[PDB]
Design a protein around this nucleic acid. Structure first.
Lengths: 241, 493, 260
DNA sequence: TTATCACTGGCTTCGTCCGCG
DNA sequence: CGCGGACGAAGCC
C-alpha cells in the first residue's frame, strides 16, 4: 500500500498556530492539512471521528521550496453599514471601522511530493479520484494541480521519491551528480509544531504536536529536468507508466 | 458542589520520553511527581505556557532551594539537586500540605488565581468569549477564530479555561472592560498585562524535571515573598501594590494586574460566564528585570524587553542570548546565570535546548501573532571565540539586510522618482537562516571561509542574490536599470 | 458531478485590485512574477450580479451571506481559483499630478505629485461548482438550474470594480471552456507554468497552449467528460476542448442541460 | 529653471449627548 | 418624552 501525492499549484498555504487577523503558513506541508483534505475527499463531516486517518505516515520531499508571500486580504470594506459583517453583540460597527483587514500568507511556486504510506491509503486515493468535496491546498481558494495523485497504488513509495520522480530545473554542474533535496520525515535540523488533528469540529478544533525531522538527502542528478517545458513532459511520462 | 482540583484533575498534556505514543493528560501534582518519567508537558497557548513555566519554576523552588557566600551556596545546593536527578514525592505533598484546600479554581473562598469579591459589585458578566483568546468577544467582528455570537455560547471545558485564564493573567487587553464599583468607585478601565508582548525563554533538558529546575531563577537575598495563589490575604484593590524583593515578586506572580472569575457548570465540566476586571488603579514599577526576557535600551535610555515580532526570524535573538560582551542590550539574567561553565552542571549543558514563547500584539487590546520556538542546543576562551563568530555573524547579517532594505526602497522611489522590499525580505531571510546556521556549525558555505574570525561577507552574496531575484524584471527600462544597479552596488561592501 | 469553467479573459491597463500599497497583487509563479486578481474580490463581484439578477440559493451556492450570522452552512460548493496572468508582467508605474485650479503669481506648482502602479495582461481565470452538494442542499433541481446557469453567465459577464473610473477595464472573456466532469475538477493552470514569451500578443497563443494541455491530460485520463468551448476567434480549431459553440449563453445552456 | 508631494480606517465597554420620532 | 445613534473616557508618550 501507499501512493505518491504531489502538492503543487501556483499557490498553497499550510498554516498553523495563527489564530488572529494575520495568518501564516509553514514552509512545509502539515499533517493536519493533508488529513483534512482526505477527510473532505471521503465525506468526513466536521466533528466526526478522524481516528481512521490516524496511523498514517507522511514523508515529504521538497522539490522547489517556493517563495512565501503576504496576501493582503480585507473583508467587508466598501459596503454600507447596514450590510456589513455582524458583531457578536449584533450591532454593525460604524462603516469607518467596519472593514476587517486580514493579512493571509501563502507559499507561491512551491512544489512538494508527499509520500503518504498507510494501511488504507488506497481507499483515500480512491476518494481523491472522485472526491466528496473539492480538495484544496490549505485555503479553499487554492486549487490543486491536476496531477494530484502521481500513482494510485505503489509498494514502498518513499523509495520512489528518493529516485525516479522528476524534479524542477536547477543548476546541474558538468559531470555532477547527487543533487541535494530536503526530505521531511516524521520519525527518524528539526522543529516541533502543533499539527495532528484530534478533531475537525468547527466549534472546537484541537490538535496535538508532531515532531518533524528535516533530512538533507542526496538524489541522482538525472532526475533534474531540462530548463524549458520538459518538466511537464517528464511528469506526464511518469504518470502514465 | 462544583470543584476542580488543579493537582488532581487532568489538564496538562504530557508526552514522556518513552513510547512516544498517545500523550496523556495529567494534573499538576501527578505531573510534578512523575517529572523524571515524562519528557514534557504542554498547553496549546504560548502565553498560557509562558506563565505556566513560571508557576512550576516557583513551586519547585519553594519546595527546594529558596532564600539562599550566598552565590556559591546556591550553585552548590544547585549542583546537588541537579546531580541527584529526582525530587522525593513526600516533599511535594509536604509543600502542598500547607495549601491543600487552596488549589480549587471554583473554591467558595479564595479561588485559585481569582478574586472572589468580584462576583458582587459587577452587574454584568464579561462572558466566556471575553476571557478566552481567539474567541470573538461581544463587540468584536466574529469573522475569524470560530464564530461566537455571544448569545448562547458553548461553555469552555475547565482545562482550556485554565489555559485562557493563565494567558489573561499574563498578557491581557489594556482596554477598558466591565466595571466594578469598589466602595463607591467605578472605573471600568483596566490596565495592561505585566509582560504584554514579549517572548519568554525557558531552557530545556531531556525531561521536564531538569528543565523546570534550570527554569528556577536565582533569588537575590531579600525579603521572603509569596505568590498571588500563595497569599493568605485577599488583595485590597486600592492602595499601592507593595514591592517584593523575593523571587515571587521577580517571577511576576506576586500580584497580577487583571482579575478573572469563572462561573462553574453544575458538574464542573465547563465555564459558563466570566468576569475580567481591574485589580489595581495606580501602576507601580516591579523591581528587577524579568530573568526570562531579553531587555534592550533605546535612546531616551528606557530599559524595555524587546517586543516580539512575527516577521523577525528567531535565530538573531538567540545570538543575543549570549554575552560577556554587550551588543547594545542588557539581556537575560537566567540565561547568564544558568548556562556558562562557571555555574556547576557537568553535562546537562551539552544537551540543553532553549525554548521561546512570543505573543506579539498591540500595545492596546489588538492581537496579531504568537509562536513557540524550540531552538537547538547552544552553549571559555574557545567558547568566547565561538560566540564572537556568532555575534560578528548576526551583526553582518541583519546589518547588510537592512541596508538592502533602504537600498530596495530608495531604488524603487528614485526610479519612479515599494513592492520590492516585502518580497526582497521574504526571500532574503528565508535564504539567510540556513547560511547562518552553516556559519555557526563552522560548515562550509559558499562565499564564506570556514574557521575564520571575520564575517567573510557571505550574507553579501545572499542579499545580492535575493536583490537580483526581486528586481530582475524591472531592471528592464534603461532608467530604472540605472537606479537599481547604482543602488545595488552598495551591497558589495 | 462537478462543472468547472476556464476562461482566458484579458484586461487592458488597469489596477482592478491592489495591495496595501498601490501595486496590484502578484503571484511569483514559474519563476516569473505575474499579476493576479484575488479570488475573493472577483467572487464578491459575482455575488452581487448573481444576487442582483435573482431579485436561499445564495447561501447554498456561495458559502454564507457576509452580513448574516452563520446558519450551519458556511461552505458553498463553489471554488474560485485566483486569476493570474498567462505571461510575466512588470508593474507599470503611472506618474500623475493633481492640478491646482486657483493660480498665484508663480507658475505650475501643481496640487499633488504622485505615482500609482497599474498593469495589464491576459488573466487565466478558473472556477468549479459541485452540483451534487447543490442538489442535496437546495432540493429542487430547477433552482439548481437557475443557480448554475445564472451563476455561469454571471461568471463570464462580471469584472471587479476597482479603480475602474480611472481605467475602463470592462471586457468579455476571449475563451470560455465549461467541462462537466464526473471524476474530479481539474484546473489548467499548470499549462501556463512557463510564462509565454511576448511581442506578438497572447490570446491565440494562450488558446493553443491550453489546447495542448487539454489534449495531454485527456490522453492520460480518458473520461466521459462533456465539454464545449466558445471563443471570439474562428481562425483556429481547438479539438481537445470539445465541440464548438457560436456563443457563450448557448454554451452555458448546453452544459446546464448536460448536467441534468 | 521651479513649483508642487492628501486624507480615511479596520483597539477595548459603556455612557452620555444629541438627533429623531 | 422616548428612543436611537454617535462620540468619548483611557491605556500612552
Amino acid at each position: 500500500s501507499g501512493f505518491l501525492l504531489r502538492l503543487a499549484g501556483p499557490m498553497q498555504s499550510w498554516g498553523e498556530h495563527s489564530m488572529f487577523g494575520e495568518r501564516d503558513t509553514l514552509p512545509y506541508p502539515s499533517r493536519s492539512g493533508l488529513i483534512g483534505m482526505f477527510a473532505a475527499a471521503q465525506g468526513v463531516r466536521r466533528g466526526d471521528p478522524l481516528d481512521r486517518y490516524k496511523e498514517l505516515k507522511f514523508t515529504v520531499r521538497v522539490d522547489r521550496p517556493g517563495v512565501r508571500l503576504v496576501d493582503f486580504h480585507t473583508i467587508g470594506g466598501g459596503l454600507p453599514k447596514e450590510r456589513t459583517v455582524p458583531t457578536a453583540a449584533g450591532e454593525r460597527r460604524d462603516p469607518k471601522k467596519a472593514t476587517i483587514v486580514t493579512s493571509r500568507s501563502y507559499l507561491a511556486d512551491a512544489v512538494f511530493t508527499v509520500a503518504v504510506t498507510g494501511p488504507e491509503a488506497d481507499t483515500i486515493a480512491d476518494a481523491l479520484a472522485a472526491p466528496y468535496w473539492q480538495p484544496y491546498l490549505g485555503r479553499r481558494a487554492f486549487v490543486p494541480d491536476p496531477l494530484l495523485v502521481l500513482r494510485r497504488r505503489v509498494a514502498d513509495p518513499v523509495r520512489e521519491l528518493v529516485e525516479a520522480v522528476p524534479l524542477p530545473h536547477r543548476r546541474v554542474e558538468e559531470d555532477a551528480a547527487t543533487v541535494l533535496v530536503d526530505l521531511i520525515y516524521e520519525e527518524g535540523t528539526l522543529t516541533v509544531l502543533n499539527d495532528v488533528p484530534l478533531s475537525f469540529d468547527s466549534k472546537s478544533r484541537r490538535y496535538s504536536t508532531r515532531q518533524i525531522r528535516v533530512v538533507p538527502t542526496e538524489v541522482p542528478a538525472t532526475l533534474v529536468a531540462g530548463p524549458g517545458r520538459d518538466y511537464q513532459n517528464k511528469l506526464f511520462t511518469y504518470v502514465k507508466q | 458542589p462544583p470543584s476542580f482540583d488543579v493537582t488532581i484533575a487532568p489538564w496538562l498534556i504530557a508526552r514522556s520520553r518513552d513510547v512516544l505514543a498517545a500523550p496523556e493528560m495529567l494534573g499538576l501534582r501527578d505531573v510534578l511527581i512523575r517529572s523524571h518519567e515524562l519528557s514534557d508537558v504542554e498547553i496549546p497557548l504560548p502565553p498560557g505556557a509562558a506563565v505556566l513555566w513560571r508557576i512550576l519554576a516557583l513551586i519547585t523552588a519553594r519546595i527546594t532551594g529558596l532564600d539562599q557566600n550566598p552565590k556559591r551556596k546556591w550553585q552548590a545546593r544547585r549542583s546537588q539537586i541537579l546531580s541527584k536527578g529526582r525530587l522525593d514525592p513526600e516533599a511535594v505533598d509536604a509543600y502542598f500540605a500547607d495549601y491543600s484546600e487552596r488549589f480549587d479554581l471554583f473554591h467558595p473562598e479564595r479561588p485559585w488565581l481569582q478574586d472572589p469579591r468580584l462576583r458582587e459589585e459587577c452587574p454584568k458578566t464579561s462572558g466566556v468569549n471575553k476571557l478566552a483568546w481567539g474567541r470573538t468577544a461581544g463587540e468584536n467582528q466574529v469573522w475569524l477564530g470560530g464564530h461566537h455570537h455571544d448569545l448562547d455560547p458553548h461553555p469552555l471545558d475547565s482545562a482550556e479555561a485554565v489555559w485562557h485564564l493563565l494567558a489573561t493573567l499574563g498578557y491581557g487587553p489594556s482596554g477598558m472592560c466591565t466595571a466594578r464599583v469598589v466602595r463607591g468607585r467605578s472605573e471600568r478601565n483596566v490596565t495592561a498585562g505585566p509582560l504584554r508582548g514579549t517572548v519568554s525563554y525557558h531552557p530545556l533538558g531531556r525531561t521536564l524535571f531538569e528543565s523546570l529546575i534550570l527554569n528556577i531563577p536565582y533569588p537575590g537575598t531579600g525579603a521572603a515573598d509569596l505568590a498571588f495563589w500563595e497569599q493568605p490575604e485577599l488583595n485590597d484593590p486600592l492602595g499601592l501594590p507593595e514591592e517584593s524583593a523575593g523571587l515571587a515578586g521577580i517571577l511576576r506572580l506576586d500580584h497580577f494586574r487583571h482579575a478573572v472569575l469563572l462561573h462553574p457548570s453544575p458538574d464542573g465540566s465547563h465555564v459558563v460566564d466570566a468576569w475580567v476586571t481591574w485589580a489595581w488603579r495606580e501602576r507601580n514599577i516591579s523591581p528587577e528585570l524579568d530573568p526570562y526576557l531579553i531587555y534592550q535600551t533605546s535612546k531616551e535610555g528606557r530599559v524595555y524587553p524587546r517586543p516580539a515580532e512575527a516577521e523577525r526570524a528567531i535565530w538573531r535573538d538567540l545570538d543575543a542570548l549570549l554575552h560577556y560582551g554587550e551588543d547594545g542590550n542588557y539581556r537575560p539574567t537566567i540565561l547568564d546565570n544558568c548556562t556558562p561553565l562557571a555555574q556547576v552542571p557537568q553535562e546537562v549543558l551539552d544537551s540543553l535546548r532553549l525554548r521561546a514563547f512570543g505573543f506579539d500584539q498591540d500595545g492596546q487590546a489588538r492581537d496579531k501573532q504568537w509562536f513557540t520556538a524550540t531552538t537547538p542546543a547552544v552553549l571559555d576562551n574557545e567558547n568566547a571565540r565561538i560566540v564572537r563568530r556568532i555575534t560578528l555573524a548576526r551583526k553582518a547579517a541583519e546589518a547588510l539586510g537592512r541596508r538592502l532594505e533602504k537600498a530596495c526602497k530608495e531604488a524603487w522611489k528614485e526610479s519612479n522618482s515599494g513592492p520590492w522590499v516585502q518580497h526582497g525580505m521574504s526571500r532574503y531571510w528565508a535564504k539567510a537562516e540556513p547560511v547562518f546556521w552553516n556559519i555557526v556549525y563552522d560548515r562550509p558555505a559558499q562565499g564564506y571561509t570556514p574557521g575564520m574570525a571575520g564575517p567573510g561577507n557571505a550574507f553579501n552574496l545572499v542579499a545580492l542574490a535575493a536583490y537580483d531575484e526581486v528586481t530582475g524584471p524591472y531592471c528592464e527600462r534603461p532608467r530604472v536599470a540605472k537606479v537599481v544597479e547604482r543602488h545595488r552596488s552598495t551591497l558589495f561592501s | 458531478t462537478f462543472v468547472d469553467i476556464h476562461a482566458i479573459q484579458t484586461l487592458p491597463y488597469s489596477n482592478i485590485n491592489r495591495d496595501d500599497l498601490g501595486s496590484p497583487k502578484t503571484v511569483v509563479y514559474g519563476g516569473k512574477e505575474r499579476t493576479r486578481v484575488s479570488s475573493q474580490s472577483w467572487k464578491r463581484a459575482v455575488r452581487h450580479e448573481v444576487e442582483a439578477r435573482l431579485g436561499n440559493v445564495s447561501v447554498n451556492l456561495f458559502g454564507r451571506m457576509l452580513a448574516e450570522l452563520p446558519s450551519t452552512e458556511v461552505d458553498g460548493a463553489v471554488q474560485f481559483a485566483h486569476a493570474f496572468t498567462v505571461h510575466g508582467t512588470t508593474v507599470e508605474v503611472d506618474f500623475f499630478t493633481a492640478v491646482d485650479d486657483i493660480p498665484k503669481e508663480n507658475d505650475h506648482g501643481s496640487g499633488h505629485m504622485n505615482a500609482g502602479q497599474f498593469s495589464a495582461g491576459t488573466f487565466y481565470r478558473y472556477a468549479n461548482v459541485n452540483l451534487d452538494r447543490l442538489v442535496e442542499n437546495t432540493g429542487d433541481a430547477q433552482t439548481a438550474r437557475t443557480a448554475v446557469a445564472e451563476f455561469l453567465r454571471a461568471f463570464l459577464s462580471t469584472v471587479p470594480s476597482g479603480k475602474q473610473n480611472a481605467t475602463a477595464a470592462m471586457t468579455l472573456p476571449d475563451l470560455v471552456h465549461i467541462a462537466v466532469r464526473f471524476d474530479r475538477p481539474i484546473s489548467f493552470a499548470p499549462a501556463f507554468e512557463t510564462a509565454l514569451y511576448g511581442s506578438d500578443g497572447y490570446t491565440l497563443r494562450a488558446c493553443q497552449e491550453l489546447n495542448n494541455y487539454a489534449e495531454r491530460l485527456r490522453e492520460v485520463w480518458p473520461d466521459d467528460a462533456i465539454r464545449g468551448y466558445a471563443t471570439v476567434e474562428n481562425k483556429t480549431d481547438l479539438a481537445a476542448l470539445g465541440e464548438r459553440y457560436d456563443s457563450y449563453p448557448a454554451l452555458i445552456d448546453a452544459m446546464v442541460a448536460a448536467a441534468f
